[PDB]
Point group: C3
Amino acid sequence: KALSAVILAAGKGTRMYSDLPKVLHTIAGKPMVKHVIDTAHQLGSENIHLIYGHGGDLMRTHLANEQVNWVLQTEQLGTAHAVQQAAPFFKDNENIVVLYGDAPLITKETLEKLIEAKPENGIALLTVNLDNPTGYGRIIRENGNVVAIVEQKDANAEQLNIKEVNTGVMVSDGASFKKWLARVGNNNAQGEYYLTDLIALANQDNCQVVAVQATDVMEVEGANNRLQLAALERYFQNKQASKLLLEGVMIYDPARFDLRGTLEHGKDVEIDVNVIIEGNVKLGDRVKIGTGCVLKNVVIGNDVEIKPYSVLEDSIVGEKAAIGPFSRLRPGAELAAETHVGNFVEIKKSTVGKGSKVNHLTYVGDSEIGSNCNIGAGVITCNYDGANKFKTIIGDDVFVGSDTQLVAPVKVANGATIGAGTTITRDVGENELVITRVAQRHIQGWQRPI
Amino acid sequence: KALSAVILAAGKGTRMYSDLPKVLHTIAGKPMVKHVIDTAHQLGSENIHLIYGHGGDLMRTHLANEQVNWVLQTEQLGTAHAVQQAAPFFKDNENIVVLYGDAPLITKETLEKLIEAKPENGIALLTVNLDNPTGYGRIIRENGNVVAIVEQKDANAEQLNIKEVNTGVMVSDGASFKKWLARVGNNNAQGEYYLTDLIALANQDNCQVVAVQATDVMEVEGANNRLQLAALERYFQNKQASKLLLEGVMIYDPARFDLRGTLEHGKDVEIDVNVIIEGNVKLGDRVKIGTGCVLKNVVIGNDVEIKPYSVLEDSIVGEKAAIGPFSRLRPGAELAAETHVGNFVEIKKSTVGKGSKVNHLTYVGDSEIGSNCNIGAGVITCNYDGANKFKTIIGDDVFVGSDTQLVAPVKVANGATIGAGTTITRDVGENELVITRVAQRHIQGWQRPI
Amino acid sequence: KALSAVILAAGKGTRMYSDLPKVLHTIAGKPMVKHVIDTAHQLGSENIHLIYGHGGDLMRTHLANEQVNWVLQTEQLGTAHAVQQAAPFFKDNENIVVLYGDAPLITKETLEKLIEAKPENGIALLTVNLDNPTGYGRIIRENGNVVAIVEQKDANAEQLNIKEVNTGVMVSDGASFKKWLARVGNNNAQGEYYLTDLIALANQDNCQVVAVQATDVMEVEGANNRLQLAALERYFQNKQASKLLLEGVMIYDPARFDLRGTLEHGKDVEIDVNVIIEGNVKLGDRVKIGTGCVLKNVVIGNDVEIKPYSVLEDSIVGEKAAIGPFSRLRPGAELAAETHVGNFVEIKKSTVGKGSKVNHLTYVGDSEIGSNCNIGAGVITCNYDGANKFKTIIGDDVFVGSDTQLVAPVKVANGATIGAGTTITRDVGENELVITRVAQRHIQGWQRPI
Ligand SMILES: O=c1ccn([C@@H]2O[C@H](COP(=O)(O)OP(=O)(O)O)[C@@H](O)[C@H]2O)c(=O)[nH]1
Ligand SMILES: O=c1ccn([C@@H]2O[C@H](COP(=O)(O)OP(=O)(O)O)[C@@H](O)[C@H]2O)c(=O)[nH]1
Ligand SMILES: O=c1ccn([C@@H]2O[C@H](COP(=O)(O)OP(=O)(O)O)[C@@H](O)[C@H]2O)c(=O)[nH]1
């Protein structure tokens, strides 16, 4: 049958000591709640009801494009109250899964098992075994079913030794949820309406609740502060690196690797220590990435080596190119096949054609550079002091001597040669040689201050 | 009552294989013994008696400014002999705490508990529970008190199973110390005067010794070699990162973060992987620090982003500034609000005014730069071949074209404009435009070597 | 007696998802099989028989210089079949040790113990204790000897609780190997000839097999995929760092240190976090290496500091030199004593004499620079657009002003002085001063676009 999710995300997250609400803090570059939304979506959820409250405006700006129903909870009166806000929208004969915006590691696989174990008119409850279950509600199994969740303070001596514990995530049909939610009270020490009580209420109705154990404890772990969040971060990154290693990516140290988005890869890819991969990154076969590199939203072709401490963003690099070390590719950098970019070089919004080299101490911006060019050390494309930023066009087989200033807008045609120390403001024609006539003063017998 | 400390710090530290004495090796940028001195001071110690010996001159030069009594021990005849060197200076009615210069992680909190548990005319002894207590003296409790410390070789079968062990740190009043120290002998396999024997001597006098367990084993851990020291280092750094995360600093990976000094922070600060913080550093609200950055003795204002692989020392950065990546701020760099410093830029002992930008391949040194200036790529402030290093003064709203050499001493007044490839040796007046007249030779039909 | 080894290295390594065969994947920069070959050699092996098959051509190109007998196995019919390929070459009265090319961490020390425990006409079998020995063959000891290796599916209830397990590495004399190998069959579920069966066959012959336990479990660990290989990598690096720390090298974080070759060191060497050491590296006394540095095939003299994010390859640095941060030394960089190389500087195949400084934004290539020179910011050695790359020679006590282009081939004699913004194409004589005569246009009353 159909499925919809409810995600609880209204918390202030006081112990984060932040102006952001609790669930907006990121894991692997994405808000915690966004992980849960994505998981709900790939689970097959028709509707996703987002219970929000604190930091309302920030939730809306940061998650403006998410396909969710925005259910604003004016008061935090408990998890049952929270879910009941969305209940008017539950279809009677759809399954409903309840998830927490601050527990982002929960997997689609675990949740499929939960949904599959839900008996008709009943509940599937996700549990977890802890080594020290102190403070948490114990699962009481009478036969194969859950008959009670006994809280720490109520449990007897032998019930305290039970390791199986309630996570609060559960699945039931929409009609059941509407019926049971209306029956939960707040007669307890905290004065709150607990979703937990649905288990007692189901048992009162002679309905079954089946437990499904989570495989990984970390899956159901929430974050109430930044220390806990950093532990979730490390577990997530290590799991991402492990999956890539098992797919054939050589990661020299998985504890020193960060993926903050998606990585598509060929075979025999090598990624050295302390690399960060952000946004959508695609690497072809036998790409090698040296230590300290940062790649954000790039496509890298087969057989390219990126040497240490290169930073690349929104760029494309063709096959057999060599980049780094200490290279910077800014947005719109498009490097063709067999190009060379070297140390202390910055390339911004420019195309560089096949075989061309830019190997030292150079800024190229808003330029088209053709094939088999040689851009010398210390070359700079610049503009006049004016308004907008104009383009430099360099054809094929051009030599640009070191320390040349190319003053946009300007064109240098095929086969041109420019001498070192030149200032180019006028168009250079095909096979034109431009050299600077320097005037120098030579003084003989000049003794330096020892 | 009053308190003074004794710190044992005379050891050669042979297994460090160093020209330094044992306690001078650093943890988090500070000598091990300096940690212990600081802890003693914040505990409220009136006097700190530093027992030193090996590497005497180095101890004095490296710790010249420490408020301690320098007690030179000519021979290392045991811990009791060491403490007795300082005993002539103990006030009869002050408490005395004994600490070890090579066990730097001991906390003020643990030591306050120790002092508080000391019975009158007695001793409080700090103990620790080990899982494998082999080699260490076992604590024998008769009722609530310690009646013996039984060494490995003397213990019977059941005493070997005792996990509680002697750390050697203790507190007693000064008169007791003077009396008992004079009674310790050296009749043992090692021929040494052990401070350990004070426990037996106290029990002989019908005086109480109360045990206080250390909460963390690592607290009382010493370092006899650099492997052990590296473990202390990692435990200290992880504990520092944990405290910051709990205060609301987002540290992406606490295992890849190093603090070597003090950090003051606002809210919503983000610190990426592999950052090093040294000396005294202050970060305002929502400062973001990219991967690989090194910050030593800097003040960073609200809302600044420091992009990857930036190194900053002895510098100030105003609010909403953007630094990096690959930027270098050397001592005396003062950047106003809303400034921009970019890749492969070095700024040394210079002020840069509000809104000004220095975005590529530039050295600025000994300069004052005003507000809303545009310093082009490849700009260099330099000096004549002479003696001292003179100043470059640039006013407000100045444009300095790329690859311009500013030759100090020189002034460029408000609103001036300098063209690319210029050499500035003479003062530039207000609203003055300076452009270089290049002479170029153009040769048509120059065929390049294919 | 004499010894020879057999190394099994024919596997395809399917779960690596690589075009390389299994044993060519690297640990610490060296193929797994190369580790095992080296260990065999230092064990004293006269012959090393390398059983190879898959990726045959790649094995030959990558290991062309290894002193091994190349034994090509056309079909993988089991470990006994593999070893029997080399058996015609076993000397009757030499010991033979069998090792696996995909288990590279096995030590010479463990293997010496194995060889020493081998009884005459018998076998020494290397075993290991696992906490979960499921799937592995259990060692059955009758008295002091091994009488059977019982596989998972054959073991009874109490045999399943045995933790001691078969590793497959063993030692026997050559005649025994020839005799027993010819008797192993393939009547089992997998239809393979197992080397394991030698233990049964020895017991049939009334020959002794003695077990030798491995001290470290990781020693005998193989890698079937890149996740397992990364774990071997981390264990190896941590063990290398631990050995160096125990020798007196201060490594701030051994979990953030990589050695990929050999390191020779003096005393009081300090290596900060995230350093990579490759090839053969030699560091003198009190060398300090800042964070992020990469050193490949370099010799560093006493008392040099290398500041953060410096990359050095195939270079020599004399004593008291200061390098970095952000410095690049390319192959053939030879820096004398007391030199200074600064940020965003690249030095390639050049000698730089004592006291000379190159501190910013500079490329020096194919040059000889004398002693006490001052190479200014923005200096570049370049060539004409021609064929090969010519040399720049700079004598002693030369001042080269900032942004000077040195156009090879060219010589600058002792004591010369070159002004900023100069283009040098002609030889400069001793004590010659060369300054550029600029022509500038000054326009007063030029108002900038606000
Ligand atoms: O009325 C509520 C109660 C809770 N929550 C959120 O649901 C999650 C778990 O609720 P619980 O009371 O079981 O744990 P706590 O919030 O006390 O840590 C937290 O992120 C809460 O902020 C909510 O959105 N509305
Ligand atoms: O006469 C002494 C004996 C010891 N110590 C120092 O006190 C610490 C602990 O002394 P112990 O004999 O219990 O351990 P060991 O020095 O044998 O490791 C070490 O740093 C010693 O160098 C000292 O300064 N003077
Ligand atoms: O006929 C063979 C059988 C195995 N091996 C290699 O020897 C090692 C261990 O052999 P085993 O069958 O015990 O483990 P598996 O290869 O099944 O992981 C592996 O690297 C194999 O590729 C080999 O070279 N020839």
